[PDB]
Amino acid sequence: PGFLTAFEYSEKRKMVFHITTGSQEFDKLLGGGIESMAITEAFGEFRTGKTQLSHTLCVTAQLPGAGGYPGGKIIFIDTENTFRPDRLRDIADRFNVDHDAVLDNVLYARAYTSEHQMELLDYVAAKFHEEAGIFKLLIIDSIMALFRVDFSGRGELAERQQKLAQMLSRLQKISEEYNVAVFVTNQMGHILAHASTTRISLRKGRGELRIAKIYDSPEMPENEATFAITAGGIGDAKE
Amino acid sequence: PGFLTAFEYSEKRKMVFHITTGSQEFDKLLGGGIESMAITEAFGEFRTGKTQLSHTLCVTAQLPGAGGYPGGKIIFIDTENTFRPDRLRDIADRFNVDHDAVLDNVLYARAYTSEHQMELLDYVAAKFHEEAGIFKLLIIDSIMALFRVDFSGRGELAERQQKLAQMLSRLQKISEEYNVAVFVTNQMGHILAHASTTRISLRKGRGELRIAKIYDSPEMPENEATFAITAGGIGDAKE
Amino acid sequence: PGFLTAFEYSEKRKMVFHITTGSQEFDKLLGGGIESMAITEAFGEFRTGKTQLSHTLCVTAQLPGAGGYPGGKIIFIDTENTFRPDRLRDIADRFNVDHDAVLDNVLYARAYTSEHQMELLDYVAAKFHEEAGIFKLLIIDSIMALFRVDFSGRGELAERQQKLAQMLSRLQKISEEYNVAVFVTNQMGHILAHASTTRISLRKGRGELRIAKIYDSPEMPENEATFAITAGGIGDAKE
Amino acid sequence: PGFLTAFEYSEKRKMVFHITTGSQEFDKLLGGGIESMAITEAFGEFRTGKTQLSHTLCVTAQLPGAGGYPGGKIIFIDTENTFRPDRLRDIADRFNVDHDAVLDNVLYARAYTSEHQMELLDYVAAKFHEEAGIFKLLIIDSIMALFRVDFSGRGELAERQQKLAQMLSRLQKISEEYNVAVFVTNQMGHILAHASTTRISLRKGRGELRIAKIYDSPEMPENEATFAITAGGIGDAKE
Amino acid sequence: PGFLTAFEYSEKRKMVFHITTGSQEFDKLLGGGIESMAITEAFGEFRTGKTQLSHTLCVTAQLPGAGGYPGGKIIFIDTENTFRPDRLRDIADRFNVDHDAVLDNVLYARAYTSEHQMELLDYVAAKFHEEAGIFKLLIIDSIMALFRVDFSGRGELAERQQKLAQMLSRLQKISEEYNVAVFVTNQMGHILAHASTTRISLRKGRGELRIAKIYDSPEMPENEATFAITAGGIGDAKE
Amino acid sequence: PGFLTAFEYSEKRKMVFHITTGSQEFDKLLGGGIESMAITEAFGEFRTGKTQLSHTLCVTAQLPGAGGYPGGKIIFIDTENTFRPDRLRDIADRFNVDHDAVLDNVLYARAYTSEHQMELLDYVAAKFHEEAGIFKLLIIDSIMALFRVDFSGRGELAERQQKLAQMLSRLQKISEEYNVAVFVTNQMGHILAHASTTRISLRKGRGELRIAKIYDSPEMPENEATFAITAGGIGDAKE
Amino acid sequence: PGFLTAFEYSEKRKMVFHITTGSQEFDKLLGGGIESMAITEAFGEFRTGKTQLSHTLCVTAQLPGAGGYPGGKIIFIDTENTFRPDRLRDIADRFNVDHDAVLDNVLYARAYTSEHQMELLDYVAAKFHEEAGIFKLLIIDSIMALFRVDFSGRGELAERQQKLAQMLSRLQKISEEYNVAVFVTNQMGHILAHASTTRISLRKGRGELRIAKIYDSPEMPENEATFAITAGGIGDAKE
Amino acid sequence: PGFLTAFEYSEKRKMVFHITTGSQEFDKLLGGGIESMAITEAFGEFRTGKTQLSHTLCVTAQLPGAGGYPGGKIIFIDTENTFRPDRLRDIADRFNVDHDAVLDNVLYARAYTSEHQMELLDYVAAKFHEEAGIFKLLIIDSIMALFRVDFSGRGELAERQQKLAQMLSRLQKISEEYNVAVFVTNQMGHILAHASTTRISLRKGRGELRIAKIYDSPEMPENEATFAITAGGIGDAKE
């Protein structure tokens, strides 16, 4: 049938793995961190760490971890142009790992147009459908931002909202079907809400520390998560 | 004739069966719980149990019960992505039933687009028309939510309201004609009102307990229903 | 000629028969109750008896009565889905009549779409044109309600008001031409006014009793009608 | 020529005859009552006698009267559905005339649609063009009312005002050309003003009596007309 | 050439003749009365004599008068339907003239539609082009009034203002080219202003007398004209 | 080349001649009066002399005058219909000239439509291109007025402003190219401004005298011109 | 390549020559006066000298001057119609030069339509492309003014702004490519701003003197320029 | 694949070179100055140095400097028309370099239309794709300004915003792919924001000095940069 049983489905959910934020109190809000078969969004301020974090996971998703997560290659479509391999080699250190590796470990792609972006997504698939079990994360930062662009004024939102979900769906179908963890940064019943299953909001608690909270995610705790940031990516906020 | 007699019709209504909410005072508002040949809606808050309940019935509709209700397979189209087989095996327990069963007992399907959703509904039929008397519940949560999406702004509601009922009708025609009990969660003379014969409103009475009320349903009692929630699904609220 | 004489017409009006409301003071407002060759509308509140009454007449129109009214079969198109054969067998009693009869005595049909509804009306005809003198009532509750649905927002009322009367005319042409009594419930120079020759408004006078009044009908009395309701349908309100 | 001389025209006006209202002080406002080669309108309240009067003339136009008016057959297109042959036989009495006659004396036709209505008018002609001098009155009550219906909202008045006069002209061309007296009831430089040469306004002076006045008619008197109503139609209001 | 010289033109203006209003102080405002090769308009109140006057000239234009005006046949297109040959025979008297004559002396035509009206005007021509020097007046009352009708709401004035002048021009081209005197009644840089060369405004000075003034006409005097009205048409207002 | 030199152009400007207003202090504002190779406009009140003046020049442009102006034939397109040969013969007198002459001296043409008007202008050319040096003035009064007519409401000004200049250009191209003096009366960066090189405003200084001023014209003096009017056209205002 | 080097470009800029305003303090604001390979605009009041100045340069651009400017022929497209060869011969004097020369020295062309204007510009080219180094100035006064005309109301600015720059570009391409100095008068990020490289604003300092300032031009000084005007064009303002 | 690895990408970023502003405290804000594989924008006031700076870099990008930047040819598309080779030879001095060189060192192109501009950009490519490593800077000042032009009013921004990014993308694809440093001046989630990776805002600190700040750029410091300007381009602001 065009669908499977509950059992046969939970057969799959046993392959749900979390990718560490690199911040224990942050991973706790996500009860593990980034999840698979689920698009996760990054809510923030003008100056947010989402861009920083993206790299962090560019690696964590290589370091084996909890739940017997092996670690795997990655795809980093960069709409904005803030990707910095240099930041990577700066992190692999805090995790004591070969430089050329982490880098040989991340797939990079610049998103220019809002058609290019999906020109890409429909390709990310092929590479996932080619071989499987290798790619554990699909990080696109930021997805939206590039769409507010090619729009035809506040009169053609209709070609945008239509196009936006025409893909955000194709993004969902990837996540759960190919089993990976898709991360996404941006600054916006909004189509990119039901779309993303977990939404993290970010605020700054005075330079060093950052407060991560949830806007809407299954079993969402009322408490916040205090985390810090440094060269070595994201980590715990000590005394 | 393109229609049957009153007698010949009441011949059918004798096959109307209720599926337990798992909460006596809740089943009383529905005078049995979920009904057949009738779409039932779930009104709620940002954080409602409708999503939880859906699973509850994912099972109750397997446990034989009142009115000589046998129990049967099910179809759970999930628009939102909050279906959790794990929650099931956690309930079958409170009802002392084989795990692999309950699961082998539920048909799962993810709704991605608002066309996909009906691509599905027109199929749910085929499986119902293939063999009969097996499927006792059609649970779609949430039906609407996925439609507020593919819409073309607040200018093309016209393609939406048109499309929405183009199906909500096809949903009705299933319920009564194939005799099953269709449950539906959402958060909205509104097309999805005459559409659904029974509308349940949900409010939270301080974490543990929840107050279920009726917005509009035949022989609707003025009183509310106090029920609780736990791992084992929905149940009665004790002292 | 495409029309007949006054005499030849009054030849027909001698076949005008009233169908009892089951409430003497109610039948008096209608000077007999429901009339033939005339669409009668039911104005009411959120919780009105119109739905209850519909069944009442589902029978009364079988019990011979005043003006030498024989009694006959019936057609109950149900847009809403509140038809209850069970309620019937509960009434035939107060009128001491065979159960299987009353039921074998009513033609049932669910209205799903606003096209289906008329798909039906144009058929109700055929059955009336096939044989005559058998069907004494055409009860559609509610006619409107199902139309507020398939509409294309408050911008396409134009396809609705046009479609609505495209039928409400076909409803009139039935009533007078085939000589029957068409009853209709709903909650709205309004097209469904000139359309219906007799309009009854309903208000509730504290649970037990109900006050029926006229909004606009030939020889409309200024006085109201106090009637009650019970399992056995509609009846007089005693001390 | 496509027109005749003044003399040759006054040749025709000598065939102008009035049809009694049955109320002397009313006939005086019209200086005879209803006129020929002239559409007369009936302005009124929710509960007006125009509907009653229509029948009255259904007969008066059979009783020979002033100006050597013979009397003749009639055509009563009924848009509303309030025509009552019974009311006729109740009037012929006050005028001591055969029942079957008065009735055999009136041509009846129900107007359903706003196209039907004219489907009729263009036929009323044929019967007038067939033989002449027999039909002395063309009573359509109400003309407008049925048009406010098939309209396409307050946006397509343009198809209505256009259609309305497309006929109200065809109504005029009948009146003067075939020489008859067309009466019309309704409740509205308005197209149906220049259209109707004589406009009578109606108000109620406490149940029994009614006050008829003129809104706009050649040689319109400033005074009103006090008339009464009973089973025998319209008559004078005594002490 | 497509035009003539000033001399050759004044050759024509020597054929300019005035048609008496029947009121000396009125004829003085027009310095003779109605003029030829010039459309004259009649401005008035709800109850104006313009309709009365029209007949007056229906005759005066037969009585030889000043400037050696012979007198001639006439064309009275009647949009409104207030033409009364009877009123004529009532006037020919005050001018001591054969009845059958005056009447045999006026050409009558009812204007029904706004297309009919011009269907006529383009014909009035033919009769004027056929033979000449016979028809001295073209009286159309009222020209406008019939146009406010067939209009398509206040949205299609564009088909009206366009159509209106499409003719009012054809009316001008008649007046000066065929040399006659066109009179026109109505109640409105307005297209029907430059159109009409002489505009007379009418007010009522207490039943018997009427005050005629000018709104805009070559060599327009500041003074008014006091005139009366009776069976014999329009005349002077004595002590 | 598609243009000539400055010298070769001043070769032409030596043929620039003024046509007397008949009022010295008026001719001074125009430093000669009407000019050639230049459209002159007449701004005024409801009751202005522009219409009177038009005739005045109908002659002055025949009387040889200053700058060795010979005098010549003329073309008087009359949109309004106020041209009066009689007024001419009344002026030629004050200038002691043959009557039949002045008249044989003016070309007359009535403007009916706004298409006719230009139907004419494109012809005035032909007569100017046929022979030259004969026609010294092109007087059109009023140009605009006839255009406010055929317009399609305040929505189609676009067909009007477009059409208006489509000609007012063709009017300019005549003036300078054929060397004549075009006079124009009317009552309005307005298209008919850059269009007309000299704009004269007119006000009334108590019946007898009139005050002519300039709205916008090369070397426009701040002072006004006091002139009078009589049968003999326009002249100086004495003590 | 479709472009040249910086060197090869400065090769051209050595041919940049200024054309004297005839006012030293004015030439200083322009550091020489009018420039080449650059459109210069004239901002002013209702009564501005821009029209006067145009002639001034009609000559200055013939008088050799600073920077070894030889002097050359000129093209004066006149939209407005205020060009006066007479004013020229009045200036050549203050510069002691042959009259017939200065005039034989200026190319004249009247701009009638906004299509004609460019019909011209695309021709001014041909004459510049034919032979070179002869024409040193392209003076169009005023460019805009004629465009506010043929526009289709304030609704079709879109055909105007589009058309306006469709040319103002073709004007730029002339200036720099053929090396000349284009002067332009008018009265308005406005398309005719980036368009013109130097914008001069003009105010009047009491009849005799005028104050020239800059609105926006490379190296624009904060100071103003006091200049006078006389028959001999523009000159310095003495004590 | 349609994209490269992180390593293989950082392989490229090692070719990222900065081009000196000529102002140390300015280069510090950009941590080197202009960057490569990155469009840099210049925010300013009516009178900003962006135009001046453009030349400065027209050279600096020839002087070898930090990070082992060799120096190379350049492309200066000039929309505005303020490019001054003379200013160059005035700068090469402060950097002691051959004049003919610096100039032979810059590629010049005037942007006329908003289609021309891109007609160019798609060519700048060809010259970059022809040979590589020679052109180190692509300076377009100003990009926007020329677009506010050909727009079709505030109604067709839709053709503009669409067209604008249709290129600003093609500009990005050049920068990073061909490795150069694109500088851009102008005065405006705005499409030309995500578009440009580094945005510099400019304010004037009293004639001599200028304060450069950042509006939005990766690792944007809160501090400002005080720099000066002179004939020799941009430089440091001393005591």
UniProtKB/Swiss-Prot annotation, chains A, B, C, D, E, F, G, H:
Positions of dsDNA binding: R148, R154, R160
GO cellular component, one term: site of double-strand break
Residues engaged in binding ssDNA: R148, F151, R154, R160, R210
Keyword terms, alphabetized: ATP-binding, Cell cycle, Chromosome, DNA-binding, Meiosis, Nucleotide-binding, Nucleus
Disulfide bonds, paired cysteine numbers: none
Any one GO molecular function term: ATP-dependent DNA damage sensor activity
Effect noted on mutating E176 to A/Q: Decreases octamer stability
GO biological-process terms attached to the record: chromosome organization involved in meiotic cell cycle; DNA recombinase assembly; DNA strand invasion; double-strand break repair involved in meiotic recombination; female gamete generation; homologous chromosome pairing at meiosis; male meiosis I; meiotic cell cycle
Localization annotation: Nucleus; Chromosome
Effect noted on mutating R210A: Abolishes binding to ssDNA
Annotated positions binding ATP: G44, E45, F46, R47, T48, G49, K50, T51
Effect of R148A: Abolishes binding to ssDNA or dsDNA
Subunit details: Double stacked ring-shaped homooctamer. Interacts with BRCA2. Interacts with the MND1-PSMC3IP heterodimer. Interacts with RAD51AP1; the interaction is direct and stimulates DMC1-mediated homologous recombination.
Family the entry assigns: Belongs to the RecA family. DMC1 subfamily.
Function: Participates in meiotic recombination, specifically in homologous strand assimilation, which is required for the resolution of meiotic double-strand breaks.
Protein name: Meiotic recombination protein DMC1/LIM15 homolog
Taxonomic source organism: Homo sapiens
Residues of the full protein shown: 83 to 340 of 340
